[PDB]
Design a protein around this ligand. Sequence first.
Ligand SMILES: [Mg+2]
Ligand SMILES: [Mg+2]
Ligand SMILES: [Mg+2]
Ligand SMILES: [Mg+2]
Ligand SMILES: [Mg+2]
Ligand SMILES: [Mg+2]
Ligand SMILES: [Mg+2]
Ligand SMILES: [Mg+2]
Ligand SMILES: [Mg+2]
Ligand SMILES: [Mg+2]
Ligand SMILES: [Mg+2]
Ligand SMILES: [Mg+2]
Ligand SMILES: [Mg+2]
Ligand SMILES: [Mg+2]
Ligand SMILES: [Mg+2]
Ligand SMILES: [Mg+2]
Ligand SMILES: [Mg+2]
Ligand SMILES: [Mg+2]
Ligand SMILES: [Mg+2]
Ligand SMILES: [Mg+2]
Ligand SMILES: [Mg+2]
Ligand SMILES: [Mg+2]
Lengths: 121, 43, 204, 56, 154, 53
Amino acid sequence: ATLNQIKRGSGPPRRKKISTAPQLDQCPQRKGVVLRVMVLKPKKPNSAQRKACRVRLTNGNVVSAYIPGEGHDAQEHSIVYVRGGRCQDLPGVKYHVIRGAGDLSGVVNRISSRSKYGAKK
Amino acid sequence: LRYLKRDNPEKYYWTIQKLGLNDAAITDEFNMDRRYMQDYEFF
Amino acid sequence: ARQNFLGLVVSQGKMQKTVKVRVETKVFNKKINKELFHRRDYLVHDEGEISREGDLVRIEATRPLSKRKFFAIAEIIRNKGQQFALYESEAQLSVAKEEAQKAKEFLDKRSVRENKLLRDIRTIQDALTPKELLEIKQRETVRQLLQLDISGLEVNLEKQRSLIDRIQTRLSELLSNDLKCDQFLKDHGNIKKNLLRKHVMMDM
Amino acid sequence: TPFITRIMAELKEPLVLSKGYNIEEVDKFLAAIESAKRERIEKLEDRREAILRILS
Amino acid sequence: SLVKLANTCAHLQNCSKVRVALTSIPYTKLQLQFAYNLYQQGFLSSLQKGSTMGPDKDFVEVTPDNISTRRLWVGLKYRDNKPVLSSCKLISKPNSRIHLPMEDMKKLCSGVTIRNIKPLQPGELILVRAHNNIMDINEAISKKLDGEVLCRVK
Amino acid sequence: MSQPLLRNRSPEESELLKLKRNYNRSLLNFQAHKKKLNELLNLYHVANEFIVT
RNA sequence: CUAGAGUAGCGAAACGGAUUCGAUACCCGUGUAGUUCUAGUAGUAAACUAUGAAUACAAUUAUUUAUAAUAUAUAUAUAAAUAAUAAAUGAAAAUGAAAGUAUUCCACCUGAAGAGUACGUUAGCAAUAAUGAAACUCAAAACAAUAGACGGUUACAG
RNA sequence: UUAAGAGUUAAACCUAGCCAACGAUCCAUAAUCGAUAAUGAAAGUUAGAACGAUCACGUUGACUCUGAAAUAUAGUCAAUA
Ligand SMILES: [Mg+2]
Ligand SMILES: [Mg+2]
Ligand SMILES: [Mg+2]
Ligand SMILES: [Mg+2]
Ligand SMILES: [Mg+2]
Ligand SMILES: [Mg+2]
Ligand SMILES: [Mg+2]
Ligand SMILES: [Mg+2]
Ligand SMILES: [Mg+2]
Ligand SMILES: [Mg+2]
Ligand SMILES: [Mg+2]
Ligand SMILES: [Mg+2]
Ligand SMILES: [Mg+2]
Ligand SMILES: [Mg+2]
Ligand SMILES: [Mg+2]
Ligand SMILES: [Mg+2]
Ligand SMILES: [Mg+2]
Ligand SMILES: [Mg+2]
Ligand SMILES: [Mg+2]
Ligand SMILES: [Mg+2]
Ligand SMILES: [Mg+2]
Ligand SMILES: [Mg+2]
């Protein structure tokens, strides 16, 4: 609070924006291999059977990635691409798989938001 | 005595000589701590 | 010209021909918006080894003289370090002289008590001699022998009080009737007030 | 150190009186009291000794 | 002494809050110059020399005999249920002394924040010390004189 | 504003001031000594009744 | 806690008696350590005014408290403390000569949890004390006040 | 020895110093900067790709010749392939 204390290092804490996807190592996405496909239960009050998968990335980190879209064709040893973005109601799942990239096909018969689901016109 | 040294050095040196102290005894930090009481055998 | 700095000798006599000089410079700290003093200690060459701790000296840039010495004392601005050593040396003898003197005085006073009243007063008053008069001599008169110190103090005190009161009364009187003060100013030779007080104070 | 020792020794001398008294002055004052009383021996010695003991 | 000037600034604010018509400040050259600048600028109604007990009716000459009991007595102004001297603050603090050149002083008087100092306000007086003379900032600009920016009063 | 803030004490004023201060100190010391001798005398009166032998 | 003394009362632990569905508790009885003293170690408490120290200043009242007068009376002046306040401040509760107006220096804080934890280091006979993380998870978490509800909560009436 | 100062490198003799809680030593990480780019009201913060400036290196290490200047993308020896 005093001037000599501010000189010695006192000041406002930095508004430091922590990385929410540390396992990508500051990459837009990483290629990975799915170790298994899981069906998890969201936190309450939400109720569903959420589609996820464990994926080992090329940098060696193993993460849990949500599989978006109505239906997916992910299976053990599938090559996937993983970007940031958590699944809010699944604790521990902090990544998303990219539909339409790698061995994961785009959503079938998607009409709206096709680019978010790897679907052609 | 440190003030006296800063003010009148001649009288300072005469005074500390007559009182039984040296310049180190005056200028050095002196917490009358347990180590002093052991080194100089106060008790 | 060469780089010059002003500093305080903070460490001398520990290295041959080298001293440590503490210098300070004005810097601006923008993080705190303040003009600060930046401090540094230099190893400085001292040919002649004239400097002492606490001296204010001007150091000047030179060729490299060692791994870390690049400056030399160019001038002793203030020499408190040398004065401290002088007084250190002088006090040694100065103190011891009167230390012996007053020890002598203490021993003499002790002896005076050793070889050392009412009986003498009785003899002086009654015998007023049986071989005792001269024996007392070896040590109008009953009073002067019984002469306390307080009486001299009272006489001196009355003298002091009289002097102060008389000076003030005379000063006020002269300042009141201002013709005779002029008379006295030309007799003895707003400033006139101070000069008048000077003349009145020497007057008594 | 000579100063501290001499001061303490002078404190420890005999016939040293407290409360700012001096033995020479005290003796002269007592003699002056007696002479003044005359002007207007063992008992006086006892009075003196009591005073010196109280003021020792 | 900036500490004593800060004490005077705070004391003036305190006396304006309670609306005392007359108060005292320490008797020093800096205090007297500051009070005189306030008096000439219209912030004070009167400035007198005096003692710890009150302003002097007649001239009393200051000497070492009475220096410790001298004070400067200032009369505060109020109008339309508002104090004329509401705020009085130091710019150059004891632990951060701010010395500006004439150009930065002009910038400050022209609305620029210099060294975190808010610029001069429409009815505000900023005082500057130069060669142990307190003076108005605009006057220092006119005389082309760098100096220590001392205090604001509004 | 033109008047000097402080006027130095002249040597004569200093001499008178030192005279008065020395007198004050001397008077206090003398009064202490006088009351001291008085208390001694008042003990010297009642010293008859003090056992020493 | 380490030694050496002391140990009447109290009393961790332990052993029993009750109570209880159960008693591992509250209650009862014996009662070791401790509480005591001497020489040490240790350096922690809600070690609190949950409020660091110093300086200058700001409107009142009432009490004491302590001096200094003046002749019990001046409902006596000058100080400190205490109590209630003005202003001011404040999220308010409230603070109130500081939680006000200012200045100087130091300590400390930066969501909850993980955690005063782990690891390391230092000290200590030990117990421990100090120093003191990060990953993981979440959109919480807290303070003052408001109105209720509730209380094996009070008092008054009928 | 060098054109040239200096425990710079080599030799000898001495003195006992030097740095450090305003952070030494050690460890890790990183080419650096601008009248360059981004951002912001600004202080600043970020980058150091592009334009320019400086440094270092040309598979790794040491040494040597020549040269005004090189441990040179040279030469010698060794390592790796
Ligand atoms: Mg959509
Ligand atoms: Mg050399
Ligand atoms: Mg024991
Ligand atoms: Mg017991
Ligand atoms: Mg019991
Ligand atoms: Mg229970
Ligand atoms: Mg029991
Ligand atoms: Mg202890
Ligand atoms: Mg603890
Ligand atoms: Mg604590
Ligand atoms: Mg607060
Ligand atoms: Mg611990
Ligand atoms: Mg050499
Ligand atoms: Mg060598
Ligand atoms: Mg370091
Ligand atoms: Mg690198
Ligand atoms: Mg960088
Ligand atoms: Mg570039
Ligand atoms: Mg490039
Ligand atoms: Mg190369
Ligand atoms: Mg290559
Ligand atoms: Mg190479």
